[PDB]
Amino acid sequence: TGHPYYLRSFLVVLKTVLENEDDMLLFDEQEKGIVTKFYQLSATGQKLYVRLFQRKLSWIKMTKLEYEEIALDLTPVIEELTNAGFLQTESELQELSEVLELLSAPELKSLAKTFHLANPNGQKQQLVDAFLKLAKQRSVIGAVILKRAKALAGQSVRICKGPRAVFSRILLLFSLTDSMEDEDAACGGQGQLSTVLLVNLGRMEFPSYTINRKTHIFQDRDDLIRYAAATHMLSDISSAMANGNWEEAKELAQCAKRDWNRLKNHPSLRCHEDLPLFLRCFTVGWIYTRILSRFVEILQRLHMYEEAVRELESLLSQRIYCPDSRGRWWDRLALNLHQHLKRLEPTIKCITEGLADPEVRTGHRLSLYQRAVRLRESPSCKKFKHLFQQLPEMAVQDVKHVTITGRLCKSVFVMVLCSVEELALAHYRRSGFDQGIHGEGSTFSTLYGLLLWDIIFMDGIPDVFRNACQAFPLDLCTDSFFTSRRPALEARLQLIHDAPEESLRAWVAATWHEQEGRVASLVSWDRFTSLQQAQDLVSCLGGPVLSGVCRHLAADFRHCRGGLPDLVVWNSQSRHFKLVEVKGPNDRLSHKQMIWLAELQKLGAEVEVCHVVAV
DNA sequence: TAGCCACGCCTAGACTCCTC
DNA sequence: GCTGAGGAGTCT
DNA sequence: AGGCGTG
Ligand SMILES: [Ca+2]
């Protein structure tokens, strides 16, 4: 009796956004009418819409449309949708390119034939270039070809870009708390539902929390429109970079750079600057900064470094947008000056200024530090004394390295085919530890999540919960998450540091039994084979260790979430555990990884780097 | 397989778009 | 260079 | 596109 998965999920999106009064302010009357028109359709008509909303947006032959779970004949349904003005028909098919596109290459031959001026053979593309030229000079004749092609192509439909645009913008908002926002969704096909979401949104159950918002992200329907535009730009840039179309990317960026400079002074930006960090990331300003970042990324690739340094300096001079990224920026500026512009004076100024900055953390901070000690203790440099300058000697403690071997066939080994990580697990089984988990960061994350679930989804912090389908409070990756909860956390961290290893085992089974299945961003329910396995692990890890890890994950999830060892292995009976970063022959330790390793040792834990050698 | 040409048929592999 | 696996239909 | 037979 239920709806198909795709419709359910689509409906969940609309519901969610529709019930925000703050968000409904950003749609005009005409627009809201289109939503209502949708709900006014038959289950069948809704089913067909979502189907094609998901598809790539373009003309579709009627003979290539077939969904039997919808209707054995689709003409009634199609009409309904055209009447509603959601779809359109060959009647409205006007553009020549569009018609030639819609044709099969065989049919494009027939048409190249019965039109004499055309040379019958070549590629679909070649023929389309032929036709599209011909018509641009002798347009009257173009009309005749258009006429005939349409006939030859037959009956056809296409989703209406007017109504569609509204559903995009709704989806965009749903995504500011979700599926573009749990890290950038490259929503191609013009703006759609991500696959994971399209499949499970309808069935997903979410944590219990209390929505309390007391600020507007957007000024008005124009602001949002300006934003959504920045978003589509940023995407296309990334998209370009991703397809190695670096030349096109440069344009798009420089183009967008102007756009951002034109906007300076607009009233809307004053309220933006004043927004707290965890919300400020949802503004044009932020996205344009994010764009500028990729821009230096692009410049660097085209080996245009003086330029790249300029931009880096811009970014670093303001403190309004993306402060988390300053670590990265400094580091990158440092490198570029030193390495590619070979310019030592500023490099030293750069390093010192960066290290001064409270915004730089973990990995990048260390990477800076090292460049300094490399620099101070270099001959062709020693003509100074300015990096002796009371550099608080941030040493990192060294850790037990180890080496094993496996015959190599991402690298794939044999023992049965396997990965580097599975190969190492084998070693540690025969080394006495009958248990092990390849979870990297997730393992530690889902413990921290089972151990602080209620403090996470705790009430009393303004603005972090905003609507129906969240999986985390919005402040989770900000300095403010800990600060906005210092009392309750300082408490719980203490209480874990002291707990007996039964308190732990119990604590876990509460959360597990209460929440098992609820979507939360830190917790992965199938990460552990059972609740039982989850309990063993915390027993071996124990209080002081767990508590210590949790402190960093609460204090700075932004800069800590990454760099945990690939493995946790433990022996069932001895209760001794081991934390293992598995390194192939062809990679090393990253700064983020070593900071962690030192840190886990100070907490007193069996930490080990395990290299693999191939044959 | 003598060596070269002329012509057209068939299909493997790449690619796009779609599905859950 | 990867962050999904797989199928079907089409082009050359 | 490009391998293959056949004329
Ligand atoms: Ca590894």
Side-chain angles (χ1 to χ4, degrees):
Chain A
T1 39
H3 282 307
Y5 65 100
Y6 53 90
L7 190 37
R8 297 170 103 298
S9 301
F10 188 95
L11 287 162
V12 196
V13 179
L14 296 182
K15 181 152 170 197
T16 315
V17 199
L18 279 186
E19 61 186 46
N20 267 53
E21 260 156 354
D22 272 344
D23 292 273
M24 283 338 291
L25 293 189
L26 316 156
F27 290 98
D28 77 13
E29 285 307 330
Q30 201 297 291
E31 274 160 356
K32 308 171 141 190
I34 297 143
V35 175
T36 340
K37 267 146 150 283
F38 173 83
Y39 282 127
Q40 283 177 357
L41 300 189
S42 46
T44 307
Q46 293 177 323
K47 284 159 157 228
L48 198 47
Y49 188 72
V50 180
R51 277 317 208 192
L52 301 161
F53 180 79
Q54 287 302 93
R55 310 261 229 102
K56 195 196 136 204
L57 149 45
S58 81
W59 293 93
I60 296 152
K61 281 174 182 162
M62 278 279 281
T63 76
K64 299 263 206 174
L65 273 172
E66 205 224 310
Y67 295 93
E68 295 186 337
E69 92 285 342
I70 281 176
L72 212 55
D73 177 78
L74 302 164
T75 305
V77 207
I78 268 139
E79 192 162 342
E80 180 188 349
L81 280 160
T82 325
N83 295 337
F86 272 134
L87 236 67
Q88 67 198 206
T89 277
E90 61 269 1
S91 31
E92 301 142 85
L93 173 58
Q94 295 316 304
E95 287 296 324
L96 185 51
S97 57
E98 294 187 22
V99 193
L100 298 158
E101 245 303 291
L102 167 69
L103 279 169
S104 84
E107 283 147 2
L108 249 195
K109 185 148 282 187
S110 332
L111 197 85
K113 283 191 162 200
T114 54
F115 273 75
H116 310 304
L117 279 150
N119 154 248
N121 282 294
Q123 307 162 43
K124 172 173 272 181
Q125 183 61 336
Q126 313 290 20
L127 270 64
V128 168
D129 305 312
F131 281 116
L132 268 182
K133 165 186 181 167
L134 170 62
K136 213 222 71 177
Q137 71 195 47
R138 299 156 59 174
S139 43
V140 162
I141 197 150
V144 207
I145 315 162
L146 169 43
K147 195 243 85 56
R148 195 166 281 168
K150 295 184 58 168
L152 191 41
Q155 286 213 320
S156 305
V157 312
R158 183 177 68 182
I159 211 107
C160 275
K161 79 129 219 167
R164 205 228 153 86
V166 202
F167 301 125
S168 288
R169 208 175 328 129
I170 287 151
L171 188 61
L172 183 92
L173 292 149
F174 169 89
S175 289
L176 302 219
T177 55
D178 200 320
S179 156
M180 180 209 63
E181 208 269 344
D182 31 73
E183 109 153 59
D184 251 71
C187 295
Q190 297 300 23
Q192 304 161 347
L193 276 97
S194 71
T195 293
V196 148
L197 207 77
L198 178 83
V199 167
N200 325 298
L201 186 49
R203 298 311 199 173
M204 280 178 215
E205 211 197 298
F206 287 64
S208 29
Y209 54 88
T210 308
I211 301 165
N212 161 32
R213 49 225 196 75
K214 81 143 224 205
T215 305
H216 290 243
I217 295 152
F218 303 120
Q219 286 324 297
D220 59 276
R221 185 178 163 279
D222 304 287
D223 200 28
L224 164 66
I225 274 157
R226 272 189 298 286
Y227 175 91
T231 303
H232 313 298
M233 184 56 107
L234 178 63
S235 179
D236 282 355
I237 303 171
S238 284
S239 189
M241 295 164 79
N243 300 299
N245 310 315
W246 300 99
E247 277 315 324
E248 196 179 19
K250 185 162 63 54
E251 297 293 315
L252 278 159
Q254 266 164 345
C255 185
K257 175 159 187 177
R258 294 192 298 272
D259 291 307
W260 169 235
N261 273 310
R262 213 179 322 272
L263 291 208
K264 307 275 194 160
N265 299 314
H266 192 296
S268 64
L269 299 175
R270 316 286 84 80
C271 356
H272 295 158
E273 295 184 7
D274 238 56
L275 268 164
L277 273 194
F278 67 112
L279 300 179
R280 202 182 310 180
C281 64
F282 306 109
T283 80
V284 263
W286 205 271
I287 308 301
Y288 269 129
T289 312
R290 291 188 49 195
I291 279 175
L292 285 196
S293 255
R294 331 295 262 95
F295 185 41
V296 335
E297 283 192 51
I298 295 146
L299 291 162
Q300 289 173 153
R301 172 65 201 245
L302 302 173
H303 300 104
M304 304 169 62
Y305 294 88
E306 306 79 7
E307 352 229 322
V309 172
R310 267 172 218 131
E311 299 287 354
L312 276 166
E313 288 173 289
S314 260
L315 298 142
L316 278 170
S317 72
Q318 64 83 34
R319 325 263 319 191
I320 286 306
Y321 296 113
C322 329
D324 45 301
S325 287
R326 319 190 92 247
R328 158 71 63 195
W329 290 338
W330 281 118
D331 217 345
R332 211 36 221 195
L333 171 67
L335 189 154
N336 285 330
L337 290 174
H338 185 189
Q339 277 294 326
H340 298 265
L341 303 175
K342 256 105 176 187
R343 202 36 259 116
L344 319 176
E345 165 88 42
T347 297
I348 297 150
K349 289 206 174 178
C350 164
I351 299 180
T352 354
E353 280 188 282
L355 282 167
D357 194 337
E359 288 308 322
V360 324
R361 315 277 182 71
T362 64
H364 291 279
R365 147 151 274 113
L366 174 69
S367 162
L368 273 178
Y369 176 75
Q370 291 180 356
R371 195 170 295 257
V373 325
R374 165 182 311 116
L375 225 58
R376 86 129 69 82
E377 223 181 315
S378 158
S380 41
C381 202
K382 276 163 191 175
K383 333 219 151 207
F384 81 115
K385 269 165 196 180
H386 319 279
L387 262 182
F388 174 73
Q389 270 179 0
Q390 331 148 329
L391 291 196
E393 215 237 296
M394 183 185 68
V396 181
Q397 333 162 322
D398 300 64
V399 166
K400 322 215 169 203
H401 286 248
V402 139
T403 319
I404 67 163
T405 25
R407 285 185 216 177
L408 167 79
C409 201
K410 210 177 179 174
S411 316
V412 156
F413 295 81
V414 195
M415 74 215 311
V416 187
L417 295 157
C418 65
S419 68
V420 209
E421 280 84 14
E422 290 158 280
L423 206 97
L425 281 177
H427 164 91
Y428 287 89
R429 264 177 275 108
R430 96 179 64 97
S431 289
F433 313 94
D434 54 293
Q435 297 304 297
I437 279 154
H438 177 28
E440 307 206 0
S442 81
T443 307
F444 287 78
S445 192
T446 105
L447 295 192
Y448 164 67
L450 290 177
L451 292 196
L452 279 86
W453 182 285
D454 64 338
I455 303 207
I456 285 153
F457 299 120
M458 165 211 285
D459 303 327
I461 316 84
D463 280 305
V464 312
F465 295 89
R466 293 187 69 88
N467 68 63
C469 294
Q470 298 189 205
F472 55 95
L474 303 191
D475 66 329
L476 189 49
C477 300
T478 329
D479 293 357
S480 70
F481 169 84
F482 194 88
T483 74
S484 302
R485 282 172 195 73
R486 183 181 300 271
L489 286 160
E490 285 293 6
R492 184 74 56 76
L493 288 192
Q494 195 62 74
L495 192 78
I496 286 163
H497 180 257
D498 300 340
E501 63 99 74
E502 316 94 21
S503 305
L504 302 182
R505 307 181 69 107
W507 290 344
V508 161
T511 326
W512 183 293
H513 289 122
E514 289 162 8
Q515 320 300 351
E516 206 226 51
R518 301 275 190 77
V519 168
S521 54
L522 307 116
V523 175
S524 352
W525 295 106
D526 71 356
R527 155 87 301 119
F528 297 109
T529 41
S530 73
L531 161 63
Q532 189 65 77
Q533 187 191 32
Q535 270 155 350
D536 312 330
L537 190 49
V538 277
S539 288
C540 317
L541 287 153
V545 152
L546 288 167
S547 178
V549 160
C550 289
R551 180 162 299 265
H552 300 280
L553 292 190
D556 209 358
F557 195 78
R558 169 61 175 108
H559 302 307
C560 294
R561 69 183 156 206
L564 292 155
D566 283 271
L567 264 34
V568 188
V569 295
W570 72 97
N571 179 6
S572 192
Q573 51 255 309
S574 70
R575 296 256 113 157
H576 297 298
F577 70 75
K578 218 173 263 199
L579 299 173
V580 175
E581 173 62 46
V582 174
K583 287 312 183 189
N586 258 9
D587 79 75
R588 297 218 292 102
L589 271 212
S590 55
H591 301 87
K592 276 213 173 162
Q593 277 169 320
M594 52 194 75
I595 293 282
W596 257 128
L597 287 159
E599 202 37 61
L600 285 163
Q601 218 160 48
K602 302 181 187 181
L603 271 149
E606 289 304 307
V607 285
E608 201 169 292
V609 179
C610 169
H611 311 260
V612 155
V613 200
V615 185

